[PDB]
Amino acid sequence: SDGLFDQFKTWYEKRHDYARDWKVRTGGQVVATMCTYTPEELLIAAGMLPVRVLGAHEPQNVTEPHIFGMFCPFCRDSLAQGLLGRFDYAEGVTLTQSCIQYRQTFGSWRLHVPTVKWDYYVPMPNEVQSPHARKAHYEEVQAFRVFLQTLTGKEITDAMLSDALAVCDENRRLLRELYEYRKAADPKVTGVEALYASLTAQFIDKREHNEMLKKTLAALPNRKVERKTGARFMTIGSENDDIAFMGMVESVGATIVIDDQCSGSRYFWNASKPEGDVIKAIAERYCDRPACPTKDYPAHTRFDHVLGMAKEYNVEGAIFLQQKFCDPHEGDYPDLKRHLEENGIPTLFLEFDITNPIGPFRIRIEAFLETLSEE
Amino acid sequence: ANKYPTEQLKLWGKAKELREQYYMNYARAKEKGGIRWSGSAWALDAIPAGLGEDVYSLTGEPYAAAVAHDRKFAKECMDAAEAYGFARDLCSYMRIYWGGMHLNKYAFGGEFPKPDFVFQTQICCSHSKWYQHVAKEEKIPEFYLDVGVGPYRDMTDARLDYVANQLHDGIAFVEKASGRKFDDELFIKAVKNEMRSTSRWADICALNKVKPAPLDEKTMYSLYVLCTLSKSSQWCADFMDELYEEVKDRVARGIAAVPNEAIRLMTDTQPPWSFLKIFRYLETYGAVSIGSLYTFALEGIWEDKPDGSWGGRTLPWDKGIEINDRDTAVRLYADWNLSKPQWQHFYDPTIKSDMMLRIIKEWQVDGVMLHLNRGCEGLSVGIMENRLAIAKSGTPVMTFEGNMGDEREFDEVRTQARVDAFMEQLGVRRQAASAWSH
Ligand SMILES: CC(C)(COP(=O)(O)OP(=O)(O)OC[C@H]1O[C@@H](n2cnc3c(N)ncnc32)[C@H](O)[C@@H]1OP(=O)(O)O)[C@@H](O)C(=O)NCCC(=O)NCCSC(=O)c1ccccc1
Ligand code: SF4
């Protein structure tokens, strides 16, 4: 009704129009990024627009020659976007190492997307719990900085890196401030609205995105809430970027008040620590971030993080959205489910392909709501 | 049919006995106060070996493959893991292993023997999740070596530092978990034995380049397995030396694994363990599989030789490099393992594409049969790009879908028909070539 979040919705729907126009306005390069561990500060410092590759959630038949169908819908949907030419404006492509399935999206993209002029794979340590991981990632971030300086022919100075980190940290802090409103009994921010904001953060110029977040926060204190909250849900998964599916969830008598997913909290959660060596500040921000399941060993630190968010946001039911074939989240699932249920949070499991008829999921959500009414 | 002399392997019985003894030793490890540990065939097993000569591993994937050979027990184990709540499309070895732990049954008899600790390498995402569940269910300490530093050919000093420094943490971990003091001399001996066994397995595979091939891949599955059990053991290194002498003699005498050899095939990853009879079927066509990147380099460690060919990696002491202290040994041990050919495709599938094309060339391969293995994300990533690179090269290549550990995703009838069609295709290509080049 009031359209406060309409700019984020426009940015999502017209993401590619945005990037092309950004290139006209700035003369800069665009870089297709993969996985939320990409050290975007370095790309921004190099004068580039990072744009996270996401899927289109449409039927596609272009990936079968490149990625075997035992792998997840997201890695295939993402690759399809490159093969279809929808990122033709992006000179670069980069992935920072996590899930091995996603590495195929990167490898097939750099080999077969003919508009790619350069590529870079960052082998960020998986074992962020090791006392040696932060030094290793410091060196990986420095090596990528050296690569980018060479590629552009322009020195990337500590001041340039610090300014880029400041913009990213401001975005992280503003998104956390937005999320704080979700803790209220009648949230002034729906889960869909939070999702538009946190997803577009990943492919809009962060200075422009920060300005829009600040405008949103200026409006929230006096925003009139008309909808009923219903049950307080949390969504959990890998990416979880199907906004249309989340809108259904919030139309049946519930509000998504918090999430554990890379479209949302797992992307932005922590700002960097104050620190004079900017390479250390950047590298450690990513090692200290809530971990992808692939990076969560020997301890399942994720379980404490998910339960902590669920309690702090007063969650009544948690919905696991799982991509078919998703090994890292499948490996964590049975015990993470048990951890939430043993701490008083009932759970629901839903599995997703590239496209799915919405009807069967709505029936399952409606049945889950009935269970929350009991006991 | 038989153009070549053929002979059965004399060391076959010893290869079978060493494997059986490995599994029996794990189960009996506590009778005399020994140590038991579990982890991948890719764990850096020389580290636990510094704790004594009575340190017995159970490597997870070879054990699960042994279970998969018993279709009924494999089904029961997978049913138990499913009942716990794990998705059926997770790694079939990992599901088998978990199920057998919950059932508390060892494939070689008795209860499932509790490990004292987990010592694991992490490169596939499921490497952590496999043993996180095990360590919680057994209530044991667990250590993971993160080897994810990218391709060996891109290695930096800092990347090698990361792996070496973690190995020093691993030493401290195994001392704490076992209560024993780590011995530098036993450790160095084990590093050297692992270098010996892995290089020597590569040397043996390189003997398969000649016509006729002295070994067929099905026979090789009972030989490459020893390095997957305890590559850092004296017994494995010494047996690889013995086996190399026998295979050298087969080459010298013109001995073929397959007496009617006319077609040389290359495979790829993890075959369906309860359906190895497919190889005997192919032999009726005069087709022999000479190996695969998987058989050659799951544990074999390779280098470029002076003539440009692929061969076993040179042992450091044959190169003037001394290994006289812990820190030197750790760094060389890290570097040796990081060169593993079967780790490179986790970063860049074209490295594996080039490796497969080189095998086709150097082993004189006529056709390729690629398993699209739904049971193993780690070895299947990049498989379709590898197929495309082989297809572009002009060598015939077919695919079949399967699952190395879970028969429910392997269709024997359809796969055998595809393999039959492939044999027909190879004959047709031979006729066309003869006709053009008369
Ligand atoms: C034990 C099996 C499974 C079966 O063995 P089989 O040979 O089929 O069966 P049998 O033992 O019952 O013996 C019957 C056969 O003996 C034959 N024969 C008799 N005499 C001789 C002779 N003198 N010479 C030659 N052969 C002789 C006779 O012809 C007969 O064969 P046929 O009936 O005609 O066809 C064996 O293949 C094996 O150990 N595989 C390794 C499994 C494993 O652990 N792999 C490691 C996985 S790790 C991994 O994947 C991974 C790790 C890390 C990361 C990622 C992944
Ligand atoms: S998927 Fe393959 S590489 Fe990964 S744990 Fe299983 S057997 Fe190992």
Residue numbers in the entry:
A (entry chain B): 2 to 376
B (entry chain A): 5 to 442
Sentences from the paper on this structure:
BzCoA is embedded inside the active site channel of BzdO in an elongated fashion from the buried benzoyl head to the diphosphate of CoA at the channel entrance. After the diphosphate, CoA is kinked by ca. 90° and the 3’-phosphorylated adenosine tail is attached along the protein surface. The benzoyl ring of CoA is laterally displaced relative to the [4Fe-4S] cluster, such that the OH2/OH group points to on one side slightly above the benzoyl plane of the substrate. Trp46, Leu302, Leu383 and Tyr97 protruding from the N- and C-terminal α/β domains create a predominantly hydrophobic environment of the benzoyl ring. Access of bulk solvent to the active site is completely blocked. While C1, C2 and C6 of the benzoyl ring are not directly adjacent to protonable residues, C4 is 3.1 Å apart from the [4Fe-4S]-OH2/OH group and C3 is 3.6–4.0 Å from the [4Fe-4S]-OH2/OH group, Glu65-OE2 and Ser44-OG. The thioester oxygen of BzCoA is hydrogen-bonded with Tyr97, Tyr298 and Gln274 suitable for stabilizing negative charges by hydrogen-bond interactions. The four irons are coordinated to three cysteines (Cys95, Cys128 and Cys380) and a small non-proteinogenic ligand assigned as water (–OH2) or hydroxy (–OH) group indistinguishable at the current resolution. The structure of BzdNO with the bound BzCoA substrate was used as a starting model for quantum mechanics/molecular mechanics (QM/MM) calculations.
